[PDB]
Design a binder for this molecule. Structure first.
Ligand SMILES: *[C@@](=O)([C]([C][C](F)F)[N]C(=O)[C]([C][C]([C])[C])[N]C(=O)[C]([N]C(=O)O[C]C1=[C][C]=[C][C]=[C]1)[C]([C])[C][C])C([O])=O
Lengths: 12, 175
């Protein structure tokens, strides 16, 4: 069972 | 806070369950910080110098779904609680902070930037206490200097009676 990217945080 | 952030969700349950099983992710990746999910836990990965970095207590020894099938860790360190995968393409890689600042900012899963006072190589206190429940799912998130460079990756909340007063983190040195 793989780890999955469910979203992302864009930094600034 | 002088660093700002916002999230974008990329998948829900069905996609997440399915992508875990097959290990194949064709989604466009972007951002400095990936929100992650396995069956039983939620957490964050911080891309520094080309590698996506997170907590062992979250990812265990697992691959990360990627564009060509599952991605093997290139770094797995049980004691420092750190694991790494080659960042998939698209991820905005940050740079290790060296300036030495003492004012740090923790980026949580909900895209808040909160103030931390560094107290030791791997500890910092919250200038304002927060409920532990507000920090759940942020393990792996970055601790940042004011210039936006990374000093460490969030690991544990030090609390009493549901409120988080300080944080334990893995110093970028480790990475
Ligand atoms: C993170 O995995 C979670 C983030 C948030 F909840 F704090 N981190 C943890 O669950 C860690 C896991 C542990 C195996 C390191 N646990 C804690 O944060 C807990 N606090 C505590 O046990 O830490 C004290 C300590 C930290 C570091 C070194 C020595 C001692 C809390 C769960 C207790 C209320 C996520 O879920 O995103």
């Amino acid at each position: 069972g793989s780890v999955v990217i469910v979203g992302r945080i864009i930094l600034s | 806070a002088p660093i700002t952030a916002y999230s974008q969700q990329t998948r829900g349950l069905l996609g997440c369950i399915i992508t875990s099983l097959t290990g194949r992710d064709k989604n466009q990746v972007d951002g400095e910080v990936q929100v992650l999910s396995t069956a039983t836990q939620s957490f964050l990965a911080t891309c520094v110098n080309g590698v996506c970095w997170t907590v062992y207590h979250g990812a265990g020894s697992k691959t990360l779904a990627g564009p060509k099938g599952p991605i093997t860790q290139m770094y797995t360190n049980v004691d420092q609680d750190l694991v790494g995968w080659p960042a998939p393409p698209g991820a905005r890689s940050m740079t290790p902070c060296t300036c030495g600042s003492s004012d740090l900012y923790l980026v949580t899963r909900h895209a808040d930037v909160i103030p931390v006072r560094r107290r030791g190589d791997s500890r910092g206190s919250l200038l304002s206490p927060r409920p532990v429940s507000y920090l759940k799912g942020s393990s792996g998130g970055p601790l940042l200097c004011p210039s936006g460079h990374v000093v460490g990756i969030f690991r544990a909340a030090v609390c009493t009676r549901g409120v988080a007063k300080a944080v334990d983190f893995i110093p970028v040195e480790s990475m």
